[PDB]
Design a protein around this ligand. Structure first.
Ligand SMILES: Cc1ccccc1OC[C@H]1CCCN1c1ncnc2nc[nH]c12
Ligand SMILES: [Mn+2]
Ligand SMILES: [Mn+2]
Length: 359
């Protein structure tokens, strides 16, 4: 009934009465009347089993990330890192089809690559001492997703770039709240990130937010629910009961990402309904996706793990039909360095809970 070393005990077995620990609770940016309002307390208690699912997913995410930090080292292949992390995540979340599991593939994007890189089979990439690696993974219970990421480095030359991005993410978390404008969250993040200047191998940079990357609302089994949180200047509001991934990306490059490298990430389009398919390999792959992932993102390694082979044409057919969308790695210019920090927040009627942050 205590967690093992390495962790193998499901979070569900660690909390025998089914009540999971809350994340950090904050007052909204006076908004104090919310924590004692009898109607807000009733409205909060109404969604309690929902918050409880996010909390179970968040405790699994915190235990996996402390475990990753203990062993991630240069010399490991990216496949080895992803498999070791996912093996742990599956055990702690007590994976059970679409009821509990991994919410999206483990990102381990390196250097100028900011996001959506996970190795496909046969990728020989090895983590290097000078690499800047963004570990971004997700867990869910009943489709209540925790989207939380951090940057791993071994060389102290990146310390101030990581501090800039962490400070910008924390500013975003602080600025966020019920009825707060999303563009106001974006402007606060940019101001903080751009106050930092960094020196890396004798070159100086003013840290740039990646202008075409952003935070986002989260929906049930829907990593992007439709609202985006900008990380640069340039007036939609946050609403009560919403869930957001507050994330920032800092870059020493142009502060703009473009699609590059082989695609690993894919996700069924939430707006496309039932589409009958007769093509047998394409029909089979769609059934595999519907059974195992639904509208959650998946990667090619996860198809290989399910025993699927020779599915690339079937997968391209699904993309061409608009049923599945590809999400290729997003990179800034060659030679640039990118960092990321991300947390999931619940906009509860009574308080703001940074559910992925322990407290
Ligand atoms: C729908 C959509 C519209 C526009 C842009 C991106 C996007 O979807 C991108 C999703 C699918 C792949 C992985 N995706 C993730 N989205 C958010 N945060 C993530 N953290 C790790 N993977 C994450
Ligand atoms: Mn993420
Ligand atoms: Mn995200």
């Amino acid at each position: 009934k205590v967690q093992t070393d390495p962790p193998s005990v499901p979070i569900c077995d660690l909390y025998p009465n089914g009540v999971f620990p809350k994340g950090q609770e904050c007052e909204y940016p006076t908004a104090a009347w919310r924590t004692t309002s009898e109607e807000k307390k009733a409205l909060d208690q109404a969604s309690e089993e929902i918050w409880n699912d996010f909390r179970e997913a968040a405790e699994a995410h915190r235990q996996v990330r402390k475990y990753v930090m203990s062993w991630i080292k240069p010399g490991m292949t990216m496949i080895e890192i992803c498999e070791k992390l996912e093996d742990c995540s599956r055990k702690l979340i007590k994976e059970n089809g679409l009821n509990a599991g991994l919410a999206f593939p483990t990102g381990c994007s390196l250097n100028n690559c900011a996001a959506h890189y996970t190795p496909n089979a046969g990728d020989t990439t090895v983590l290097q001492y000078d690499d800047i690696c963004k570990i971004d993974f997700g867990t869910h219970i009943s489709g209540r997703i925790i989207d939380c990421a951090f940057t791993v480095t071994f060389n102290p030359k990146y310390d101030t770039l990581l501090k800039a991005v962490k400070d910008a993410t924390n500013t975003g978390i602080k600025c966020a709240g019920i009825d707060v404008r999303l563009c106001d969250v974006g402007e606060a993040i940019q101001e903080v990130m751009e106050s930092y200047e960094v020196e890396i191998d004798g070159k100086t940079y003013q840290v740039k937010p990646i202008r075409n990357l952003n935070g986002h609302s989260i929906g049930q089994y829907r990593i992007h629910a439709g609202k985006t949180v900008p990380i640069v200047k340039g007036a939609t509001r946050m609403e009560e009961g919403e869930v957001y991934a507050i994330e920032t990306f800092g870059s020493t490059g142009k502060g703009v990402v473009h699609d590059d490298m082989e695609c690993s990430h894919y996700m069924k389009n939430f707006d496309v309904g039932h589409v009958p398919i007769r093509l047998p390999r394409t029909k089979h792959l769609l059934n595999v996706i519907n059974e195992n992932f639904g509208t959650l993102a998946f990667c090619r390694r996860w198809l290989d793990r399910l025993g699927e082979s020779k599915y690339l044409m079937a997968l391209k057919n699904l993309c061409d039909l608009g049923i599945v969308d590809p999400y290729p790695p997003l990179c800034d210019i060659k030679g640039s360095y990118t960092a990321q920090f991300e947390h999931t927040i619940l906009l509860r009627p009574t308080c703001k809970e940074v559910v992925s942050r322990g407290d």
